[PDB]
Amino acid sequence: PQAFFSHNNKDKKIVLEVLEHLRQSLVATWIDSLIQQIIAGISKSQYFLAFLSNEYLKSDWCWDELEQAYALHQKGKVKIIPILLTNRAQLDLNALTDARRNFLESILTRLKYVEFDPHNMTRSLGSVAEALWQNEAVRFEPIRMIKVNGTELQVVEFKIPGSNLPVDFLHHWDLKIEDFIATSPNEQKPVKFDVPVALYGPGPNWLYAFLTLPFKNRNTVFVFNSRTSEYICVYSKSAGLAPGMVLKG
Amino acid sequence: PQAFFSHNNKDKKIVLEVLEHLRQSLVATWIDQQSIPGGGSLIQQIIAGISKSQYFLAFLSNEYLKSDWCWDELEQAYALHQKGKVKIIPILLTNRAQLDLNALTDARRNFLESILTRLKYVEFDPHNMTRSLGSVAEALWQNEAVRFEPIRMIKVNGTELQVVEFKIPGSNLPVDFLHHWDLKIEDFIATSPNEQKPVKFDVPVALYGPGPNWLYAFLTLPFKNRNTVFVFNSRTSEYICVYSKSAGLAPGMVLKG
Amino acid sequence: PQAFFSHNNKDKKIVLEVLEHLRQSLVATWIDSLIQQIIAGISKSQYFLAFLSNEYLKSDWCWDELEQAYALHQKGKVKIIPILLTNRAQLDLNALTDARRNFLESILTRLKYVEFDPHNMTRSLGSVAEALWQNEAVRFEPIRMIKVNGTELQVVEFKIPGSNLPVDFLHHWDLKIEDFIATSPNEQKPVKFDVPVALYGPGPNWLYAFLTLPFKNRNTVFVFNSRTSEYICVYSKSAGLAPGMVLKG
Amino acid sequence: PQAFFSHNNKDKKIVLEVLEHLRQSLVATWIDQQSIPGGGSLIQQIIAGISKSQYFLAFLSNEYLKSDWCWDELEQAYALHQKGKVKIIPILLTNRAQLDLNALTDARRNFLESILTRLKYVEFDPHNMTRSLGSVAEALWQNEAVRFEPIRMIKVNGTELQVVEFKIPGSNLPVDFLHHWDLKIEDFIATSPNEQKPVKFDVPVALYGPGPNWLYAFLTLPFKNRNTVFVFNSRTSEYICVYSKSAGLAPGMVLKG
RNA sequence: AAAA
RNA sequence: AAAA
Ligand SMILES: Nc1ncnc2c1ncn2[C@@H]1O[C@H](COP(=O)(O)OP(=O)(O)OC[C@H]2O[C@H](O)[C@H](O)[C@@H]2O)[C@@H](O)[C@H]1O
Ligand SMILES: Nc1ncnc2c1ncn2[C@@H]1O[C@H](COP(=O)(O)OP(=O)(O)OC[C@H]2O[C@H](O)[C@H](O)[C@@H]2O)[C@@H](O)[C@H]1O
């Protein structure tokens, strides 16, 4: 899915870090307009990431977009999820006018919010990830680099919410893995360039085919077979690895 | 699995037909001046690839027993089969009773009798084409891993599709099966509509048949930018598409079959 | 994609630097009028690079050209993107008249802008380039000099926005590389004279043919194949190199 | 790859035809007093170029099976083929049954038998021109890298064009393959319309067939300032133009195929 | 055939 | 044949 970030320049340090963590989870992140950019793709367009902070709400030009974003979210095109840089209690709610205060209280009452803090980085990042992926289909755990049996490999982990998906779910999915592959070693991307990529997690075989197929001539693809709980190679794009090698997981 | 053909031109009419049937079943076929740029002919063509090299096709016929040009070939083929490099499977063009055994010498007759007794054979008859073809295909696939039924040109829900059917003998395979397999599917797709090949050019291909996920991935992977790939899912029993290489075909729709 | 710079003589030092950096990215750049060559070429003419500066806004004989540029820009023949020498806050807007100030606010708000600073040169230049290539087809990263396996070489890096292009895209492209090859060692051009040039980056083979073909009898052409990740030489216009030699990654 | 033709004038009618067909397939065809500005006859031409020198096309025939002279060169070709510099592809103008073996001496007969059994040969018949021509083309291309089918002149969407087919045996080539290739396109480009050559002058040329991008670039690059170049992309199966050397043809248009 |  |  897509995810746009709305923020102030003061919290850029946190914004870039959360952006990097999200991009590590195979979600399209665009920062730099954003409101006319909303009407694009399918009804499953994206989710709005609003980063609420004390110096942030003092700017009206940081607020008109969110006002009209609520206006266009009531029609169901997009959904907003607010991020509290500071806790609810110490938010400067006095400075704003009456209408601003009521709209903010409505947005933090009728709409579920999650809180972010710098001290608990791991917990805050996990909470924003889960509260961001609560209303969506199969997840995508962040890429982890693990060296198995002397062979370097990066593994993408996905978990199915529930036990089944609609048979035509692939039609309405808006994620394609082609643009999430690094082209150069120096370039930063969710998937390391030329580094073997493995598939992990239970799921229907057609989703496995859809994930593995676009990787031709880009990276060698490993896949997990739970019958014996080991990795299996299907593509030989790097010398020294043949299709059929097994990695003791 | 490769297959080297030994025959005579008097049987070319049936050799071409059996070759076409085998090629429609995802099997590498090799006839006269064919491929393997090595020594060539056939006898030195045996020694290439993995221990699962091929299954010899000795098209025995009443007139085949002449022309020592082929009997020496069969002799060397069995000699190197005794080492286990290749396994011979004979095809009897005519029924066993009316083979002109008297024409052969004593040594040739003894060799042929030993071959036809120790080693199983397949009877072939022009009259019953489909049963003989099924018999020879099943005999070829008998001592092998997951089979491959002939590609079938079927029309589903208004869109044209070809399916590749594979059945697993038993219900499990060694986890390192893919290492020793001698089938590379990317060479069996035609580049032009008129060119004859196991897979029609640009026609969507669907994988059907129960099996492990890694086999499915290895089979759908080399098809990228060649043919739109459909996949059969047994949970609700309709084909599932994972490529958009042809106009009007998007990844995700269903074909109720 | 051509690029027309309208600016003042005061910031000419940074104008020339941004010009050189842009030219290094295979972007056609013209400086020395600017209003009437706008009608030339194809519908994709260029994007106007109007240099917004505090000294610039006091020059009405440089305001008029921007006015006519925007007047034509309603029709969509050209589009203007502004570069901010100073931060948006410290502009001298009060001395401006009512109509000109309103026009400046309209263009600054309804149209996205980008901010430049003399200190952080690298990130500012990267942002300028990204703003240039936002709405365009396949990108073009700046040419870099790398000696691979003891052989001098420059790589032309191009990135596909997304994973597919229109099949008839080549018809409407406004880039031919024949004008971007140096004819003399002294003459400064994006492609240095007689040195090997390589094409690196994923893309369809027809684009590779189009980008390699005009190079005949000009420079030895290298190419990168990602199957095993080494460069491949296809043309030998210089001694010591043969078609078929490899450069290890 | 090169091809040297050894024959007799009694078979010139078919020799010129097969040579023309071969030249249509982008292979170097050398005949008497025709090429090699650094030698003469046919024998010492072998010591030239790379280890992939050429394949000897010995046009065996009943009238050829004598012409004493021919033998000396046939013997030398075989003797230096034992070193592996050249290969011999014998062409039987007549079937081997009516080959007058009795006229030859014991040494010549023994040598002919040895070369006929140990080395693969191709039968040629006047009646089946297409099949025999395809067979000899396959004989040429069997022990080589990516092969070239004959150039076909086809009009697509009302636009004149020719296509150079090329198919890669197997699925991959050595990365350094381009170093050892003996095929350069420049030598096969016509200079005048009346001049006969594999590539017609100024006629648009289309590259079609699956292969690596570097091979595509190498095959298209020498075409600058000579002919308009078309490239086939399999994403939508349409021809794409990359050069505008003829009026009315801009780089970027598509040809529905 | 929903990690067989 | 969209870095095979
Ligand atoms: N396809 C055929 N073409 C020509 N003659 C044939 C063919 N099939 C059978 N015969 C005849 O039947 C006998 C076949 O033996 P022979 O071919 O002489 O010699 P070998 O056993 O060492 O095979 C040489 C190979 O090289 C070539 O590629 C051939 O096609 C072979 O595959 C002779 O009477 C043939 O004329
Ligand atoms: N290409 C040929 N053209 C004409 N006659 C030929 C040819 N090939 C064989 N013969 C006949 O084969 C017999 C033996 O002479 P030959 O094998 O020719 O000699 P060589 O290999 O030292 O080349 C000389 C050729 O080169 C010149 O270009 C001419 O064409 C010469 O023929 C004669 O009856 C020839 O007529």
Author numbering:
A (entry chain A), C (entry chain C): 2 to 33, 42 to 258
B (entry chain B), D (entry chain D): 2 to 258
What does the paper say about this structure?
To understand the effects of Cat1 filamentation on the catalysis of NAD+ cleavage at the atomic level, we solved cryo-EM structures of cA4-bound Cat1 in the presence of a non-hydrolysable NAD+ analogue, benzamide adenine dinucleotide (BAD) or NAD+ at 3.3 Å and 4 Å resolution, respectively. We could resolve similar pentameric filament network formation for class 1 that represented the largest number of particles for both cA4-BAD-Cat1-His6 and cA4-NAD+-Cat1-His6 and therefore these were processed further, to the exclusion of other classes in both complexes that were part of the same network. We modelled a pair of Cat1 dimers in the map for each structure. In the case of the cA4− NAD+-Cat1-His6 structure, the observed density was sufficient to model ADPR, but neither the NAD+ substrate nor the other reaction product, NAM. The BB-loop is predicted to control the access to the NADase active site in other TIR proteins. Both structures revealed that the active site is formed by two TIR domains from a pair of stacked Cat1 dimeric repeat units, suggesting that the catalytic activity relies on the multimerization of Cat1 dimers upon cA4 signal recognition. We tested the importance of these residues for Cat1 activity by making alanine substitutions (N10A, D33A, S68A, E74A, K121A and Y122A). Altogether these data showed that Cat1 active site is formed through the interaction of two stacked TIR domains from different dimers, a finding that provides an explanation for the importance of filamentation for its enzymatic activity, as well as for the cooperativity of NAD+ cleavage.
Here we investigated a protein containing a CARF domain fused Toll/interleukin-1 receptor (TIR) domain, Cat1. We found that Cat1 provides immunity by cleaving and depleting NAD+ molecules from the infected host, inducing a growth arrest that prevents viral propagation. Cat1 forms dimers that stack upon each other to generate long filaments that are maintained by bound cOA ligands, with stacked TIR domains forming the NAD+ cleavage catalytic sites. Further, Cat1 filaments assemble into unique trigonal and pentagonal networks that enhance NAD+ degradation.
